[PDB]
Write a protein that binds this ligand. Structure first.
Ligand SMILES: CC[C@H]1CN2CCc3cc(OC)c(OC)cc3[C@@H]2C[C@@H]1C[C@H]1NCCc2cc(OC)c(OC)cc21
Ligand SMILES: [Mg+2]
Ligand SMILES: [Mg+2]
Ligand SMILES: [Mg+2]
Ligand SMILES: [Mg+2]
Ligand SMILES: [Mg+2]
Length: 81
RNA sequence: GGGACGGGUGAAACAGGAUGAUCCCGCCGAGACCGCCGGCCGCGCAGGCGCCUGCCAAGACCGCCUCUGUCAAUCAAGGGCGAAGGCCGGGGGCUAGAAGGCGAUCAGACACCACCGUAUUCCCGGCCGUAAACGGUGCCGCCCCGCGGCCGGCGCGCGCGUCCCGCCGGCCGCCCAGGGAAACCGGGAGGCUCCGGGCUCUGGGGGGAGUAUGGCCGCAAGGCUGAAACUUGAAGGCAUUGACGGAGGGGUACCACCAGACGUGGAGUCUGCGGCUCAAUCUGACCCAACGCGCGCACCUCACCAGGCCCGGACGCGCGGAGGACCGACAGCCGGGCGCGCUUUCGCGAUCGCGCGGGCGGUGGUGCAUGGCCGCUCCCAGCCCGUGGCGCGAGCCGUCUGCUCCAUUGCGACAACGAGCGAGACCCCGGCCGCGGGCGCCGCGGGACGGCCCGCGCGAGCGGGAGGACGGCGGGGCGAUAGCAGGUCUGUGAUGCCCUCAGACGCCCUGGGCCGCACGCGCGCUACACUGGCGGGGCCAGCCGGCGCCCGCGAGGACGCGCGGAGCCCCCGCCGUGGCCGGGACCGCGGGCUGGAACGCCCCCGCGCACCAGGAAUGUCUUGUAGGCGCCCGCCCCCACCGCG
């Protein structure tokens, strides 16, 4: 399914922003575990967790290949010079 | 010259062609016209103005230390010009073309389309004197934010280019203020309720009516001037939201189509529906959004028809009542039958009776008085809030003239910012795996997410390929705001207002009807046969589920115990294109079941209607789908061609 409601996008974002180092760009199992983790957030369902994780993956690689709008990745370091 | 069609239309048909058409070339004649350049260019009082050459007069503007000295502005009466069409008298006669004719189209078409064609269109002389003759805005005059284009003339500066800086006049575009009902104007429609520069003309709700009667002009057609009676409560202007469009641009769906399949409409029958009938054949619903639907009519159900018992009249006031209120019965008749009623004669005892008030009940009416529940708009994707801003205001922005999505699903912008519902998310079912448990396979979890590769695309996301039980909304449920005079008072101790209320529409019994049939159609069933019918045999389902022995051909029956699954299909044979062994409607004896009671339902023998694939018309459908085959439940004393599965 190609439906991506707002909730998925906003949640996947806040999650990537608040938690990068613990993750990888193309994985789906590590990202799924990170989402399932309690500190990061809470997902009542399973299908929701899977969808959010997938969107997290696609955002993460879209970022790692190149900086992405709306993402507070903490990248001033390389440009604050 | 050459040899067969040409013309014309959406498609055709009238007219032309072996008398040589259409087609190519050349020549001849006449009369109209003045193209591409041609324009937010220009000229003219307006109407209007475009070939070469030449002639005649005229005009605004610019430049000027040239002349005069108020000679000016606007205007009834009066005068002149005045598109096209039209008229009088003469010319000329190619195009087009009122009238007229003819061919199509149409229900008709004397109209739109095709073809032929008169006046007219052209010139001279003269009448007419009207146009959305529009900038729908009178003439003269002053002030007025800013930017820009073009035309003509003049001047300034320089690095001399047809440069850039200005002046006058003219034609235009945008626009700050300001104005206005607003659209809009802004080279005023500004400087005006803070309401006075000068001159002229017109109007006073809509029709009657620019009509009648007079007058003037005109050959005429007609023009200028121009009432009343009567009638009427609105007619109009600018703008807003919806609905509609034989309007445009994007999208979408087997209740749309393409490609195909299976059908219906043809016959007989089941069932419901209108009509006809009867004593009654009780009713509701009429495009999708009524017509096997309001869950199986011998009695009840049941409302309708013909007839009969009962009060089951609560509760308060007056009266009477045990010196007897009210209620039952043997026998005999009449009555379908009953002590219903009739002829006597016995019984019981205040549980009351009569009049007045007031109840209860009713498948009685109004669904256009209502609640609730359904259907439809809607097999959609849309709907609203707070702050702020634009408008006098109804209203608008937010809520998208971009790209994607099945989807107001998302990316990216924007006088908008920030939220919510709906959508998705969610719940049930199934497919693969793990753990546990177990009379009987049933409890908890995992797993799939546009995740991986490749292309593109800023992106959202699109196309392909993999591995995987399953690959991109697998099937159902729930279902936004707003609304319909949709259906239901015949579902109810849900109901407002009317009408029934002791010879009752109350309640109970006996029969009958709802099924009656010259007729039109809606959902279905069975068949038209060899891809078949008949006989014997073998054999596998799931929602789920009860069997033995003995009689009887069978249907069924008498006993006694707890135990259990089919059609198609496959195999061997008969038939052999004949309305034949296809098809089994209709009808005639008989044996049984249900039930108080067959009109209902099964079995046996016999008889053996149409029907040879069904016209105009029309329905449904994309994987375990269509179609074919059968099996269980609902209602039900018996009964499924129905419906949910
Ligand atoms: C009801 C009269 C109309 C129908 N007819 C005959 C059938 C026909 C068939 C056509 O091709 C499909 C056709 O082309 C469009 C025209 C016709 C005529 C046309 C009649 C109507 C006519 N006037 C109104 C609209 C119209 C539009 C047309 O389209 C341009 C047209 O074609 C020339 C003719 C017409
Ligand atoms: Mg003329
Ligand atoms: Mg005028
Ligand atoms: Mg005034
Ligand atoms: Mg007035
Ligand atoms: Mg008037």
């Amino acid at each position: 399914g190609k439906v991506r409601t707002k909730t998925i996008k906003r949640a996947a974002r806040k999650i990537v922003e608040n938690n990068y180092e613990s993750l990888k760009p193309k994985d789906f199992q590590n990202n799924k575990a990170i989402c399932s983790k309690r500190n990061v957030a809470i997902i009542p369902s399973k299908r929701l967790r899977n969808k959010v994780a997938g969107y997290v993956t696609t955002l993460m690689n879209r970022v790692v290949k190149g900086p992405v709008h709306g993402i507070s990745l903490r990248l001033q370091e390389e440009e604050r010079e």
